[PDB]
Symmetry: D2
């Protein structure tokens, strides 16, 4: 068997075991700032991703086994105007050499063309695109910006959101939950996801986020902490 685990109470300003992509950076105070902020205000047309350094062995073709994993992180999405927000933040798995994809509604995870890339993600969508449901939502996405399953999400502006995500290999069940401690409000969505068929044997895990493509659709996407463990046997 192979177990791999890591836990940050906060992030290090120059983090060597976190690959920073796009505009992602860690603040002096140890927040993982996924999207751009200038003069303490979020900027549009921004995209940032962060991956853990060590690839995670999620399945093995030789032994035909699949990994079960669990991760918990807290994040904040703040927007100067509650009514106009975009685009969102997501936890995702992708091939180790994964690079930022389309910005805006694609969340830096997906793009177009039949050549849709291997990426499984739990997204926290704050903007209803043409492929979305009408209200803000938490979606389970499998190789597409369109969620296979989702649950309506009462986003709370600027409030800390605690997230727990677990994948049970034995039942191919991916579950994702969000709780705002502020008002003890929760949401959850689960889906049957075959990882072997959606992703390669090894993957990198992390976060991706994008601010909106207009000045009036901006917000922050900061990750405050992160714990993650995966076991393959």
């Amino acid at each position: 068997s192979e177990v791999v685990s890591f836990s940050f109470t906060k992030f290090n300003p120059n983090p060597k075991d976190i690959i920073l992509q796009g505009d992602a950076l860690v603040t002096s105070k140890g927040k993982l700032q996924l999207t751009k902020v200038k003069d303490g205000k979020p900027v549009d047309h921004s995209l940032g991703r962060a991956l853990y350094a060590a690839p995670i062995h999620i399945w093995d073709d030789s032994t035909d086994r699949v990994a079960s994993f669990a991760t918990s992180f807290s994040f904040v999405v703040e927007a100067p105007d509650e009514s106009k927000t975009a685009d969102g933040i997501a936890f995702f798995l992708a091939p180790p050499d994964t690079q930022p994809q389309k910005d805006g509604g694609f969340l830096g995870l997906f793009n177009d063309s039949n050549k849709s890339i291997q990426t499984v993600a739990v997204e926290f969508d704050t903007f209803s695109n043409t492929w979305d449901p009408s209200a803000r939502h938490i979606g389970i996405n499998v190789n597409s910006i369109e969620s296979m399953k989702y649950v309506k999400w009462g986003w709370e502006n600027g409030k800390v959101a605690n997230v727990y995500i677990s994948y049970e290999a034995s039942t191919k069940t991916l579950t994702a939950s969000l709780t705002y401690p502020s008002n003890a409000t929760s949401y959850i969505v689960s889906a049957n996801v075959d990882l072997k068929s959606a992703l390669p044997e090894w993957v990198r895990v992390g976060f991706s986020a994008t601010s909106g493509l207009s000045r009036d659709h901006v917000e922050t996407h900061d990750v405050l902490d992160w714990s993650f463990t995966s076991t393959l046997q």
Copy 2:
């Protein structure tokens, strides 16, 4: 600091680090059978509880600190008739010397009289009593059979339910979630619970369950696995 953790993939037929109360027993196959089964059929007027041997330090008066904990267990509730079920199963914390309370709708956790006992529990209620909401539910209960918060629960007869419960001391947030891998269906409920004011410094953690008080309101309450960790600092 003090960390305490334990993990059973299944239970041992004669388990010395599990205190069995009432009719609770572990089957040869390693299932924690909370309620009575005779000829493979659940019997009425049954009550069983199971606690971990070692008390858990959840708060300390001297250092004024509170513990954060997390537990995951999978359970099955099977009833010969879908329409008539009772009463339920619950994960709970109570003083170390805790003993079974009222049966039936009280879930072996609570009883009557102003002398209501110290017990915090996440309950999986399958019968609507006079103090319940109308439909089956997952409730957060604080020193009362009446839930402070609850979420409607689409109970699936005989199907495995995976549960994750976490308490974040820093925000006094208790969250409880249920997912049926069978059909990737989920439910979640969270509540602000001050543990210091509801329970003593040390507690025992475990499960409690009761079958209905009539022959036509019977079901099983089996726990298949259990992991639990708590840290106090």
Copy 3:
């Protein structure tokens, strides 16, 4: 499988998941004081033991498997006079209902009569009895006060000793090591121990210590911290 683990950075003055036996108590500062101290000076004819509350499943007759475990603790032995010391302190496993045995050189673990009790222990002996080697030693003991294997031990008066003990089930190897960080000095002893044949399926783990039987052979036996994990599969 079944995993069980606990970690104290220090002890709680009134510890509910530590069974205190004999004169053992935890000080206000959180030290596990195994032997008696009066006016800050160790007293003779003292014996104290401490066990973790939850029994540990070390082997299972049905599945014919044995547990692998590992524990680390730091301890101090202080004596007003370097030349005259007694008797020692030990980490040990014994049946769950284990009670203090003979004092003095028997370390509160063993006694006489063909009815020698089931107890495996790693002892830190500070007095050469008739059954001991001549110099102070770390011994692996299997159902006898006489060590099966030992290594000469350069005891450092009043200095912190860090101990790591591990049992590898697959090779029936018990290893015990001591390091004084003060002067980076180390000692180690290992032995082939069949746990199934020496102890029952379930056991309690902990510490035992005794001061000498004369006024001029006194010392303290304090445990400062303790971590312990055991897995059975």
Copy 4:
């Protein structure tokens, strides 16, 4: 704080979270073969290293803190002739971009010139060079092929050696132990090592090994398993 941990019961033939350097490879059976083997026989002039993918934060200049870590691995060194062996294998820490250094007696870790590189290592030396003690030894090395402290090591040809290494930041104590389960024989060495002064803030951890520079001084250097955890607070 930041915790990082990983555990392999064995290695994966194409391991993406293990950087393989020099001649190092993983066999079909999952052994980490550090040095070359041709027709099942070890070859001379060989050097192989393996590092974990994710850098480890061992100290932080801003917060002036140091990490405590612990690792356990089992390894085998087999030589066709007991009397003539070389050179050895070592666990080591070095800057993340670390590359193989001199072969032979330098163990792929060190080389010459005042420009001696930052590398701390626990070495299992099977050949007495001009800078070594006379007999085979386990050495603690700090930025030099010459060990600061060592203990004579009774190497057992072809037998499994279990190793436990721990660094206690609070006392700057590095301890390294070896036990042969075959005959319950142990060795240990500890040293006061200031990591902040010997290595940069971030490092990569892993193994390095070299076979001798002559045909009659050859042996294997295989790692069978590996667990490692480090916490910085």
